[PDB]
Amino acid sequence: IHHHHHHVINLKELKILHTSDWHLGVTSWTSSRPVDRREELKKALDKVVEEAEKREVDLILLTGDLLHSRNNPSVVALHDLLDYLKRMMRTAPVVVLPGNHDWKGLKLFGNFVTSISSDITFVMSFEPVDVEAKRGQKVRILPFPYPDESEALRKNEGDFRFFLESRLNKLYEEALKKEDFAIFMGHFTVEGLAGYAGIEQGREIIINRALIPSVVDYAALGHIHSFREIQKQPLTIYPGSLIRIDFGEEADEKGAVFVELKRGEPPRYERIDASPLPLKTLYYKKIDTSALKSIRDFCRNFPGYVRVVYEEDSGILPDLMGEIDNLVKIE
Amino acid sequence: LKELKILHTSDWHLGVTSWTSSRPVDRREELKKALDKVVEEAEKREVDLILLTGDLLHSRNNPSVVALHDLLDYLKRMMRTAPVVVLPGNHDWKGLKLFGNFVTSISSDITFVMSFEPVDVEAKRGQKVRILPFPYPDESEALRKNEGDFRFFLESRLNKLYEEALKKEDFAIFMGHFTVEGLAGYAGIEQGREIIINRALIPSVVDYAALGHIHSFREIQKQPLTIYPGSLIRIDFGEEADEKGAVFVELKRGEPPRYERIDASPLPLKTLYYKKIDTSALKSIRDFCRNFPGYVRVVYEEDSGILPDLMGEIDNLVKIE
Ligand SMILES: CCCCN1C(=O)/C(=C/c2ccc(O)cc2)SC1=S
Ligand SMILES: CCCCN1C(=O)/C(=C\c2ccc(O)cc2)SC1=S
Ligand SMILES: [Mn+2]
Ligand SMILES: [Mn+2]
Ligand SMILES: [Mn+2]
Ligand SMILES: [Mn+2]
Structure with missing residues (x-):
């Protein structure tokens, strides 16, 4: 048969796989007893891939820190990342919002990979992108990455807050110019997160959940390790990591999220449990x-x-x- | 299909600044003009396959953002004209092999040959082309052996490529990144360790041998047709008398190959x-x-x-x- 996208006339449905925060390459508890989490993590990733194929999702959303190392990922981690990127692309089109990274060539390669493939998209800026899902659905992506360059804000908390709000307003206006579906993707910390220990050695961006454009069908967030249903309108979810990275995640449920959208119906989602080690x-x-x-x-x-x-x-x-x-x- | 039109360009040296010790000159604008002329000529002649060899980036291990941007830009401009096959040179970055295989897996218009293993590609008009790659032997950039065991290692792989080239469908193309032994009018190694290969060891059963790493055009031999295209600009005054450009190669199954030099006309x-x-x-x-x-x-x-x-x-x- 063929291995391209289908084109179903007047289709108003969209099945979404959203997974986040893989942390490929992590070794836990280096100061006491190092444990390479790769085998456990690959087991969880295989479970998420299998569930994507069984449910025949139309679109795969990737957020958060897919790589544990911010600036020096190992060859094995990079190999696993690209390996699993391909495994999802074979299932359905992929949209990736890369997390906090330093390397400046990564944006060029991300734009190159995006230009040469119709099954993966790297959103590296605030500009909206229209993508095509597995069954031909037109999907508008509203990306809200970590404001690069100014990782040091170089401004007070008042102009910065107004800058972020202005970007959210623009995304709202662009979400109104949507064809079929519109998905928000963001890499930040929702304001006043309940049961969120704190920043794990990093500078955090705080965004009030009401500032997420309400006219999107789904808000796909990443960067936090624990699954959280932030709100229902618009449905806003952190999927969480696929393994328990450290003991602060002892009580967490780990996995991905299956989201189904239907024009005229309210969105519904199921949690895909990765069942990692306790x-x-x-x-x-x-x-x-x-x-x-x-x-x-x-x-x-x-x-x-x-x-x-x-x-x-x-x-x-x-x-x-x-x-x-x-x-x-x-x- | 019993025809194959080839555009072969090499050694772009994207990112080079010349004469840094005396008066630095950023060659980017001149180089892009020359690159544009080669891209236009590929479109005009409607080539079936584009071969990229040599040092496409001037910096071996620290290319600038601008250079990387230009490389990926012109890679895309080539892919839009015809399928591309790239033999990347000597690099240190270890992700390069993973990324090269990833890009190759996700696009049917570019192939990065990162090892000695042969690859079968399809040209614009359906021609099946077997690629016999001979990259710089990585890992052992330090030979870790005398000139006698190393030479036998290289010969073993050229023999392997010869045997794999015999198992070809339509056309077979050799791509190598080395210095042919006894190059005539060849100044010498430009601050690097050179691997020397006698031209008779290039598998004769290939339709074309696309070489790179040399700044000046060379027709090494005619059977098999073996060409260095040279750089697109005159990088230094040793190339003052050089004519700069790419090579257009036309192959016909059963007939002898012919080629034309595509002049990029850079600054004198x-x-x-x-x-x-x-x-x-x-x-x-x-x-x-x-x-x-x-x-x-x-x-x-x-x-x-x-x-x-x-x-x-x-x-x-x-x-x-
Ligand atoms: C799939 C891309 C194929 C083309 N391509 C690159 O992306 C390179 C990148 C590179 C990056 C850093 C560095 O230090 C040396 C080289 S080299 C090359 S060919
Ligand atoms: C979270 C999405 C990540 C997407 N992504 C990369 O991070 C890649 C390469 C890389 C190379 C060196 C380095 O220090 C960091 C990254 S390639 C690619 S796709
Ligand atoms: Mn993060
Ligand atoms: Mn995280
Ligand atoms: Mn070279
Ligand atoms: Mn060179």
Whole structure:
């Protein structure tokens, strides 16, 4: 058969796969017990790809930090990124909003790749782009990247806030000039995020969720590790990461999002669970004989990674990280 | 299909600034003009395949944003004319191999041959073209071996390419990035380690051998037809007498190949020779550079005391030796 897009007359539906924050190349807990997350991460990524093919999505949205290293990604990480980029392109057209990166050639290569393929689009600026989905649907993309060049704002918090609002207003005006569907893609922190620990060694951009253009069919956000349904109109979702990067994500549910849009109907979405390895933190005052029993008993049949937090040294501690290959951190 | 029209250009050196030690000159504007002329000629002749070899970027490992932009720009302009096959030169960046394979996988109008493995490509009119790539042996940029085991390694791959070239469909094209042994009128290595290959070891069973890495055009041999196209601009005064451009190659199954040189007409260079720099010499130098639309070098033999600031009063004079 053929392997290009279909063209269905008068089709007013759009199936979306939105995944985010892969962090390809991460090794966790380097200061205590380094753990290469690649195998677990590739397992989760395969699960998301398989779900995209089964549901026959029309469009794949990629946000957040797909690479863990901001400026020196390894060859293996780059290989995995390009590998999984191709695996999605074979399924449906891909739109990528690259996260916070420094390299200045990356925009040129992103524009080059976009120019030579009709199945992947890199949105590297604030300018809107019209793309074509798997079944011919015309989709207008409203991108809100991290304001590059001025990673140092070079201005007070008052002109900057008005600059961001002006960009959001322009995106609103461009979203009104839409054909079929319109999707917002943003790389920032929604104002007053509930249960959001804080910036993980980085400068954060804060945007009020009401400033997201209401006339878009979906708002695809990234940069935060935890899934969050920010609002319903417009439906605004952070998908979260695919693995639990650190123990702050112990209680998180990890995966991607399947969004279905229908003209005339309200949008609906399902969470695609990647079911990565679990995390557990064990708390003790001192590591006494009672604590040693609780640690060894829990870790023995726990299929994930364990952290132990204690207050005071009570003598010499046994080689717990030797008898327990599951124990990755004792502070 | 039993015909194949080829545009072969090489060694663009995008991003070069000439004569940095004396009077830097950004060659970008001149180079883009020459590149535009080659692109236009590819469209006019309606080539079926475009071959890119040599140093498309002047900087081996730190190309500027402007240079990278121009490279990707003219890559796209070539892809719009006919399918492109690129033999990238010696580079350090390790992502280059992954990105090259990625771009090749996602577009059916460009192919980056990043290894010794043969690749089959399809030309504009459906011609099946087998590419026999001979890149600079990466990893071992330091040979890590004597000249005897290394030479046998290279010969083994040329033999392998010969055997793979025999298993061809329509046409077979060799692409190599090396220096042919005993090049006639070849100054020498321009600040680099050279790999030397005897031209008789180029597999004779290919329809065309597209070479690069040399600034000056060379017809190495006719069976198999082996050509360096040369650079598109005169990078330095050693190329003063060179004619610069690309090569248009026409192949016909069963017939001998023929080629035409496509003149890019870049700026001319001129070297002025004097015994000593006397007052008559300054007048002649200033008068010549005033009406010369290119770049001028002055070399003189005898110390002539202090000479006026010729490189200040003459924006045309780029080098005094
Ligand atoms: C798929 C692109 C194919 C063409 N192409 C490049 O993108 C290159 C890039 C490069 C980048 C950094 C550096 O330090 C040296 C080279 S070289 C080359 S050919
Ligand atoms: C999150 C989307 C990322 C998309 N993306 C890259 O980041 C690429 C290459 C790269 C190379 C060197 C470096 O330091 C950083 C990046 S190529 C490509 S597509
Ligand atoms: Mn981020
Ligand atoms: Mn993140
Ligand atoms: Mn070279
Ligand atoms: Mn060269």
